[PDB]
Ligand binder design. Sequence first.
Ligand code: HEC
Ligand code: HEC
Ligand code: HEC
Length: 68
Amino acid sequence: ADVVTYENAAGNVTFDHKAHAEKLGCDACHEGTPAKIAIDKKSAHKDACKTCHKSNNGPTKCGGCHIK
Ligand code: HEC
Ligand code: HEC
Ligand code: HEC
């Protein structure tokens, strides 16, 4: 879909499925075939989201992703 907000206990986080793509052109998050990647407090903190953010001047902070 477009903007998807993950309402977890530690602050909701906002996947701008659209706005990220309006820069990043799907492929950036999706190796050729776009599909539902399992996002969790495992994935989202290990590599998914993180490594891209790390690779730029990303919001490298908990409150940088989570509303608080
Ligand atoms: C990385 C930040 C992403 C961008 C930018 C795009 N997608 Fe994505 N997509 C991403 C995740 C984290 C997920 C899982 C969402 C969930 O809770 O299941 C997805 C999922 C999809 C899906 C599933 C169906 C849907 O979202 O309606 C598809 C088909 C999909 N993504 C397509 C897609 C396209 C076409 C993108 C460019 C406009 C795109 N995604 C960007 C992560 C990210
Ligand atoms: C690169 C492949 C990215 C992935 C994967 C994710 N994000 Fe991201 N994010 C990315 C960029 C380039 C930026 C914006 C930088 C500037 O001009 O471009 C962001 C920013 C965010 C933000 C902050 C928005 C703001 O007000 O600046 C959020 C909330 C964010 N990203 C969340 C987010 C999540 C939760 C992701 C995985 C589900 C994720 N991003 C992946 C690049 C990339
Ligand atoms: C954006 C790239 C994130 C950063 C930086 C951090 N977190 Fe995160 N976190 C992110 C996502 C996409 C999720 C998904 C929701 C889920 O419940 O898995 C999470 C989840 C958490 C949770 C879980 C809360 C719950 O209800 O169980 C916590 C406790 C959490 N995140 C904490 C947290 C902290 C302390 C961070 C800084 C070190 C942090 N997150 C960074 C995305 C992102």
